[PDB]
Amino acid sequence: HSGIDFKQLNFLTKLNENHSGELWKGRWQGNDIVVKVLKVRDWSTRKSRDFNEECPRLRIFSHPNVLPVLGACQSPPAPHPTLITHWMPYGSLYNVLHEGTNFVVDQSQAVKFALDMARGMAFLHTLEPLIPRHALNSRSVMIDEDMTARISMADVKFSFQSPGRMYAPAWVAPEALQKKPEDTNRRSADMWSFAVLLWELVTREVPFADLSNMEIGMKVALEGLRPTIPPGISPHVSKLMKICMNEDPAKRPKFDMIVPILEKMQDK
Amino acid sequence: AFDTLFDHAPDKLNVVKKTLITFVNKHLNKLNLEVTELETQFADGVYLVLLMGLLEGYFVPLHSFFLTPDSFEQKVLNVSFAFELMQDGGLEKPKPRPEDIVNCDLKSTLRVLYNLFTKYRNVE
Ligand SMILES: Nc1ncnc2c1ncn2[C@@H]1O[C@H](COP(=O)(O)OP(=O)(O)OP(=O)(O)O)[C@@H](O)[C@H]1O
Ligand SMILES: [Mg+2]
């Protein structure tokens, strides 16, 4: 596994630059791709080794609702630690729900998104050990050409990638804002995130949009800030949202238990 | 530059101070935390970490630092962690040693805060 050759990448257009580095649209070996270039202070042989051991786990080709990292460019010899994944025309779930200038997805499509993500996460929860530093939120799920929602493996943070900084705390379980991952049931923390995604699909609002990230984490962690359960939705949607966001991690369902509930919601 | 302002410009120095009170309260007030005293309230590292998240748009998980430090050591660690977040944001490594902040050296503290104020003037 020598990775992908950075010299084979055709960079077409820059999409973003942020705290993580940059994202480009491009092409590689007949694939339409994005190229994520990671910027890292005090890059070392140790971090480069870690990058090359962590990336292989993200290359998941066996589930329709998981979007694999296709491969990565090792650095050296690449200028920078780099990974690539397929280009998803609708972008992120976040883009589609909140930045959708063209059409508004209907609630039936919303339900199918929920089902897609539940299925992707039940799959990932079968992995042993779990993929480390994988956070479910609307920025880390992509929407493919046929509107299929897919968990973004290119959104898993690497061990050297902004440690101690959380840029999407609104979807994080209260215990996971405060405790080391080792000290948390990760599977239940992820179900909290799904509960917030349900809330987001119901409201078509960003959770805590009026609060900075630091405010969100501190108030959720220390002051009990919670999403307000939306008014007059079906009791069954309501009950599902409530059970998934149980204050008690041990009482939150598993993804594989909510999949059949969601299936019956498409068409009973 | 900042030395001349500290050592030789007290009428200016107090302008800057009252403003640093404005600035840091602009941000920390959001967390229901007030800074009244610049000489001591940043010594333990906690406000510097919190402030960095406020200024740079992230939350810092509570397990990543000591929210209620119980030693000189944990304070030095908090301050060092803050300086690291500063360099992540593109600041050059601060001149003061982390211990200078914990030891309440006023020049050291005001320098760090001043450099923050300058970089993050438009942040709301
Ligand atoms: N596979 C993809 N296909 C199409 N667009 C994508 C894909 N991945 C990401 N994007 C788009 O690029 C934009 C920027 O993504 P980028 O990864 O730079 O930022 P981010 O996901 O907010 O933060 P992070 O650096 O932590 O991953 C996303 O909002 C999305 O619109
Ligand atoms: Mg991303």
Search chain A and give the residue with CA nearest B92: A41
Pocket residue to mutate for ligand 1, from A22, A34, A133, most atoms within 8 A of Cβ: A34
| Secondary structure string (H, E, C) spanning chain A | CCCCCHHHCEEEEEEEEECCEEEEEEEECCEEEEEEEECCCCCCHHHHHHHHHHHHHHCCCCCCCEECEEEEECCCCCCCCEEEEECCCCCEHHHHHHCCCCCCCCHHHHHHHHHHHHHHHHHHCCCCCCCCCCCCCHHHEEECCCCCEEEEHHHCCCCCCCCCCECCHHHCCHHHHHCCHHHCCHHHHHHHHHHHHHHHHHHCCCCCCCCCHHHHHHHHHHCCCCCCCCCCCCHHHHHHHHHHCCCCHHHCCCHHHHHHHHHHHHCC
Phi, psi (rounded to 5 degrees) for A6: -55, -35
CATH code that applies to domain B1-124 = 1.10.418.10
In degrees, to the nearest 5, what angle opens at C-alpha A71 toward C-alphas A166 and A76? 85
Domain with CATH 1.10.510.10 in chain A: 88-267
Domain with CATH 3.30.200.20 in chain A: 1-87
Determine the Cα–Cα distance for residues A23 and A13; give it in Å rounded to an integer. Answer: 9
What is the four-CA torsion angle of B48, B53, B54, B58, rounded to 10 degrees? Answer: -170
Helix (H, G, I), strand (E, B) or coil at B65: coil
Determine the Cα–Cα distance for residues B51 and B82; give it in Å rounded to an integer. Answer: 9
Domain ranges of chain B: 1-124
- What's the N-to-C CA distance of chain B in angstroms? 27
Pocket residue to mutate for ligand 1, from A70, A87, A92, A137, most atoms within 8 A of Cβ: A92
Determine the Cα–Cα distance for residues B76 and B14; give it in Å rounded to an integer. Answer: 27
- The alpha carbon of B50 is separated from its chain's Cα centroid by a whole number of angstroms, namely 9
Q: Which residues line ligand 1 (CB under 6 A)?
A: A 15-16, 18, 20, 23, 34, 36, 85-88, 91-92, 95, 139, 142, 155
**Using the beta-carbon criterion (under 8 Å), do A214 and B85 form an inter-chain contact?**
no
From residue A99, how far is each of A91, A139, B112 by CA, in Å?
10, 12, 38
Determine the Cα–Cα distance for residues A55 and A203; give it in Å rounded to an integer. Answer: 35
Which helix (H) or strand (E) is B14 found in, with range? helix B10-28
Which helix (H) or strand (E) is B28 found in, with range? helix B10-28
What residues contact B32, with CB distance under 8 A and at least 6 apart? none
Q: How far is the CA of B28 from the centre of ligand 1 (A)?
A: 30
Q: Are A201 and A113 a contacting pair, CB within 8 Å?
A: yes
- Experimental method of this PDB entry: X-ray
Helix (H, G, I), strand (E, B) or coil at B93: coil
Local structure of residue B58 (DSSP, 8 states): -
Helix (H, G, I), strand (E, B) or coil at B71: coil
Strand-strand pairing, A66-67 and A149-152: parallel
Q: At what angle do helices A107-124 and A255-266 cross, to 10 degrees?
A: 160
Out of 3.40.1710.10, 3.30.200.20, 3.30.450.40, 3.30.930.10, which CATH number does the structure's domain A1-87 have? 3.30.200.20
> Which of A214, A210, A231, A233 lies closest to A222 in space, CA to CA?
A214
Amino acid at B47: Y
Local structure of residue B96 (DSSP, 8 states): S
Q: Is the peptide bond before A230 cis (omega within 30 degrees of 0)?
A: no
> Taken in order A82, A83, A86, A90, is the CA torsion positive or negative?
negative
In degrees, to the nearest 5, what angle opens at C-alpha A156 toward C-alphas A153 and A161? 145
Phi, psi (rounded to 5 degrees) for A35: -120, 115
Q: Indicate the resolution in Å.
A: 2.0
Superfamily in which the A88-267 domain is placed by CATH:
Transferase(Phosphotransferase) domain 1 (1.10.510.10)
Q: Which residues pair with A84 in a beta bridge?
A: A35, A71
